[PDB]
Structure 1
């Protein structure tokens, strides 16, 4: 087993954050550590100055090879900063390792007894780009072999390698301190989940097993990689149009550019309702049947597929390549024409999903420029349900994301 080599595994059991490896590390929480808030084995490090202090059974340290794995999610606030922040500290008497954030990079440092160090560095920010990892969960794995290399993997893919043969002795520290410096800036925060240390250098194959197990392939994700939830506000976007929001216009839905180009939190968020009597606020899972609701001008509506296609000459007679616009309906209920299934994009761990309808004909939701009003030449960016979608299953136009208001991404506070 991969887990046979775990010498530390921080997990939430019976409500507390403990070591479950079998080695019984001391695990002490200080200040405002929120644990188990997004994912079971998560914890939050903020400018509260909260800390987690781990003390290993020293005998574990009786040095050739190791791996450290965990997921991390770093606020926009912290990411945008040019400064360096130590996040996990295991250096004492000059030597050990640490994990830092610096200028939108994550950095792993290994330091010898002369204070000489080597590092692995990855630019997760990419200038706060929407295609980068700012405030998104990503999976980190660092492997070390003291006679060779240390290697940095992100989401199961090797990114960087560093020779460490020039280092002299490293004296490992039985203490590991998680946390950043206290600060008045309340929006500086990050989260870690599933923190593990292994006494071997994990192979690429084993790293990918850990990654796929911990990503929770069952669970649809929001834009940040949190679990998607029922009854929760999201700015629903098509992959191709992150700067557009959903609006009703002349009895259909269209995608309109938000006035401030720089903002993720736009207008008209939707909520997702279970068609299958699932628990309130519960996680949305691959294959779930759902409805979309929208509060608009002080009235609650559900989204439904149009009965007839966008092309008037087709009437009710379309058989192939049928394209249906969407509209709002104020009558709320489990109407089949407004029930959709949400699925994960097969073999893609992207924080996106596809949405299908099985009402009368099999359709898939996508966005593109159409003439969506039956009796009009006018163009619009339009979310539509289309038939015969086999050749579109890999098109980014078929991918949807759901942006929640998340404390790691603050806009006009």
Structure 2
């Protein structure tokens, strides 16, 4: 695939440069922050922040005029996503013609415009009304393919979403200059990030688009809710996929999931931090298969989360051997205690992770409505460790996410 790359913006020796071999000029204006979350990323957060790319014009005398692909990841803040306005983000229109990428009312839009100012567009609603099921402030992978013989096509995370006919446009005059940046007035919380920006001189196959996607998602790296690398020490609101409006609370010596008082907020209560059981550095990336512990600062004391030794059902008398369900508890004695060591893994194939323990029996963490106190028949939404979990490996009840306080999603805690 890389053989057809005619532009590849990557961070080399602490600079954003073109590594394609064609040595495009890459000039940064304003105060563009680079390599803040991912190596090849850059942030557009102010009206003056611009990256100006000038390609060697001779590149345009090639298959690029007949077929091309553009790929990159993008992450758009909540406040920018919420705006009804239109913002040009990547501009390669000169003299009435070329292409551009815009954001408008929670959509991304790719525009191709001919020499008569007639244009065609691909539009994707990434916001879904700021739904937590949507992509607001989440990294997603974009790929546009263009073929003058037919269509331009928009792929999101490797999947075709939209197509538009372009064979009926008149001449398109491409320009050698690409300008990244927002010219409109934007508020302090309005910002976006792009990473791994590439242009190819061919129309990539579906298979090849997915190879680029899987390469660049970094399957080794567990992700937070937004698609950023998960890190040791960082505070996260840990949630089960099924219960995004609940927080983890100790109640009568176990942990349960309690609904936060403001149902519309992601940043709730009692964030956890993740610690390495293998002595990795503070704030280092958490990798697929890493052995970890969970800490929680609660009422001014630091605790570690442990699995209960006995199941939630008193009649099992500590002798359960199949379909065993264990509550989670807080322990004030901190250390590499086996009962509190877990393994974290990305979900085979399918920004969620699964969490396992191999202390005494193999278990997997899930959340469901149980009666988690041995002395009681009271029901609670409960995070539990269960054995014999083969049939639950595709259940969303086994999927966990970690919400960091991210600058692209701002909230203020009520009193």
- TM class by shorter-chain length? over 0.9
- Is 179-188 or 32-41 further displaced after alignment? 179-188
Deviation for aligned residue 1:183: 3.1
* Offset from partner CA, 1:269-310 (integer Å, 9 cap, x none): 000000001121000000000000000001100000001010
CA distance in 2, matches of 1:235, 1:30: 36
CA distance in 1, matches of 2:247, 2:407: 21
Deviation for aligned residue 1:185: 1.1
Deviation for aligned residue 1:30: 1.1
Q: Is the 8 A contact 2:87 2:102 kept in 1?
A: yes
- Is 176-185 or 268-277 further displaced after alignment? 176-185
Deviation for aligned residue 1:264: 0.2
CA distance in 2, matches of 1:187, 1:290: 33
Deviation for aligned residue 1:48: 4.5
Q: Is the 8 A contact 2:8 2:20 kept in 1?
A: yes
- The DSSP-based 3-state class of the residue aligned with 2:33 is coil
Q: Is the 8 A contact 2:221 2:230 kept in 1?
A: yes
Deviation for aligned residue 1:166: 1.8
Structure 1 residue runs of 5 or longer lacking an equivalent are none
CA distance in 2, matches of 1:36, 1:400: 27
Deviation for aligned residue 1:246: 0.1
CA distance in 1, matches of 2:186, 2:76: 18
Q: Is the 8 A contact 2:93 2:99 kept in 1?
A: yes
Q: Is the 8 A contact 1:49 1:183 kept in 2?
A: no
Q: Is the 8 A contact 2:87 2:184 kept in 1?
A: no
- Is 333-342 or 40-49 further displaced after alignment? 40-49
Aligned to 1:33: 32
Deviation for aligned residue 1:315: 1.4
CA distance in 2, matches of 1:8, 1:91: 18
* Offset from partner CA, 1:240-259 (integer Å, 9 cap, x none): 00000000001000000000
* Offset from partner CA, 1:343-399 (integer Å, 9 cap, x none): 011011xx0000000000000000000000000111100000000101111110000
CA distance in 2, matches of 1:120, 1:282: 38
CA distance in 2, matches of 1:276, 1:366: 24
CA distance in 2, matches of 1:39, 1:125: 22
Aligned to 2:176: 174
* Offset from partner CA, 1:141-185 (integer Å, 9 cap, x none): 000001210000000000001001221111101000000026361
Counterpart pick for 1:260 among 262, 282, 288: 262
CA distance in 2, matches of 1:125, 1:401: 19
- The DSSP-based 3-state class of the residue aligned with 1:209 is helix
Give 1:262-301 correspondences, 5 Å limit.
Answer: 262-301=264-303
CA distance in 1, matches of 2:388, 2:375: 24
Aligned residues: 410
* Offset from partner CA, 1:198-242 (integer Å, 9 cap, x none): 000101010000000000010000000000000000000000000
Could you say what the CA RMSD is over the residues aligned between the two structures, in angstroms?
Answer: 1.0
Q: Is the 8 A contact 1:293 1:303 kept in 2?
A: yes
User: Residue 259 and residue 51 in structure 1: after superposition, are their counterparts in 2 closer, same or farther (change >3 A)?
Assistant: same
- The DSSP-based 3-state class of the residue aligned with 1:254 is strand
CA distance in 2, matches of 1:352, 1:49: 36
CA distance in 1, matches of 2:54, 2:36: 24
Q: Is the 8 A contact 1:47 1:182 kept in 2?
A: no
CA distance in 1, matches of 2:70, 2:267: 35
CA distance in 2, matches of 1:323, 1:49: 56
Q: Is the 8 A contact 2:10 2:40 kept in 1?
A: yes
Deviation for aligned residue 1:47: 2.7
Deviation for aligned residue 1:339: 0.1
CA distance in 2, matches of 1:410, 1:11: 29
Deviation for aligned residue 1:32: 1.6
- The DSSP-based 3-state class of the residue aligned with 1:207 is helix
Q: Is the 8 A contact 1:80 1:103 kept in 2?
A: yes
Q: Is the 8 A contact 1:364 1:387 kept in 2?
A: yes
CA distance in 1, matches of 2:265, 2:69: 38
Divergent runs of 4+, >4 A = none
> If the length of structure 2 is used for normalisation, what is the TM-score?
0.98
CA distance in 2, matches of 1:340, 1:135: 29
CA distance in 2, matches of 1:160, 1:37: 31
* Offset from partner CA, 1:50-100 (integer Å, 9 cap, x none): 000000011111101010000000000011111000000000011100000
Structure 2 residue runs of 5 or longer lacking an equivalent are none
CA distance in 2, matches of 1:131, 1:385: 26
CA distance in 1, matches of 2:347, 2:150: 38
